[PDB]
């Protein structure tokens, strides 16, 4: 039962040199296998980065910058992916892989690489009231869109006439956008009568130490 171990997450500052390890289980030896490396950015499929067996046997790959390279650590029984001069676009998930004669293609769990220098960014919040169409179907969905924030962690709460709402809220996890910032959405699902029965509804997004609250009012 051979398995590849990768650290689930790694953080490093820009310009640093980092070592991503793919440790083989005790039963197999890293000298005997060519370690392959794959990189995956959000919203796209993985791409072959490189493979390293030894200085004699290795391959770099079309378009892969020389700062990426492969290596091994026989004492730790590990394959290594090395990145020098870390850039912000190097943020990705990194997967290692070997071929085992009896276990076939083995993937590591993947390392999620974070670069630490990025500045804080406040969320921009847009709140939509329900459509007249949906209202005519006796329902009302409030849509709260939250974009361009970093760090990715936010808290979303809803209010009715300034008082806390206790149900009907679904909030997506933060995803990363094309500008390396984070985005999320939160929905308050009501009936048309519940929508009519308050003078204001509000979506309150808490990011870092502060909150930005948007408000809509029926009719």
């Amino acid at each position: 039962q051979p398995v590849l171990t990768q650290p689930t997450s790694l953080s490093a500052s820009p310009g640093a040199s980092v070592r991503l390890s793919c440790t083989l289980s005790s039963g197999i030896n890293v000298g005997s296998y060519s370690i392959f490396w794959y990189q995956q950015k959000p919203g796209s499929p993985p791409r072959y980065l490189l493979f390293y067996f030894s200085d004699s046997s290795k391959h770099q790959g079309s378009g892969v910058p020389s700062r990426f390279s492969g290596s091994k650590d026989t004492s730790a029984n590990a394959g290594l992916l090395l990145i020098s001069g870390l850039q912000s676009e190097d943020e990705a998930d990194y997967y290692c892989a070997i071929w085992h004669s009896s276990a076939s293609v083995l993937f590591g769990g993947g390392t999620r690489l974070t670069v630490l220098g990025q500045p804080k960014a406040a969320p921009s919040v847009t709140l939509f009231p329900p459509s007249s169409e949906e209202l005519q179907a006796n329902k009302a969905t409030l849509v709260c869109l939250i974009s361009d924030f970093y760090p990715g962690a936010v808290e979303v709460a809803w209010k009715a006439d300034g008082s806390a709402v206790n149900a009907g809220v679904e909030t997506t996890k933060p995803s990363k956008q094309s500008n390396n910032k984070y985005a999320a959405s939160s929905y308050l699902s009501l009936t048309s009568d519940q929508w009519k029965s308050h003078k204001s509804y509000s979506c309150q997004v808490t990011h870092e130490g502060s909150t930005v609250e948007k408000t809509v009012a029926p009719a």
Partner: protein, 227 residues
Amino acid sequence: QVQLQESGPGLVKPSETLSLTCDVSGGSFSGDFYWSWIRQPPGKGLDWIGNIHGSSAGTKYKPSLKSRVTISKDTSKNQFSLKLSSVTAADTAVYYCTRGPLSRIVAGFGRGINWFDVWGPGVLVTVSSASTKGPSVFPLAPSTSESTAALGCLVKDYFPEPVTVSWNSGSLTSGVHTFPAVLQSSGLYSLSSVVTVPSSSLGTQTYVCNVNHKPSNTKVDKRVEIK
């Protein structure tokens, strides 16, 4: 360029057989390289299913799947296929087809079996017992207005993923933000796509979201009007 493209049903019921095909263009199927199937559960990592060699048609599968998996080929059509029987929710994933490098690159290397050099874009397969459901598309009408105005479409209560949204038949890309869907306790998905435009544009330009939900064979074009 040797371009790959996965196809197949986006939704398969439990215990049934998942069936996908990879169409290959720009290059021949036959050759000393492996054609492979790899899958990735949403947010989950990479998992190798199996491969078929280009010139020998021999197969190799993941040992924990050998009883369930069949990888076959169609030389007349230049495409290979994947069949995974008795599926469960554990088989929900994006499925990729891949092609190894040419023999010239592997000089004494072991076949490049685990070398996945070109990838398809991947198709999501949801294994679920719930029925397909098309979306209800509601306008998100812009709002006193600021210098920029946001308008959008709410794509409400569909199953399964995914849904794509364009704006004005693709003529409009700048300022478009389509958000990842929420999944409700009801089992149904909802998402929103907004475009942010200058105030001036509201009196001159029409705005139509184009919603594509392939699993229900539904497309909706909804004009986001101002009221």
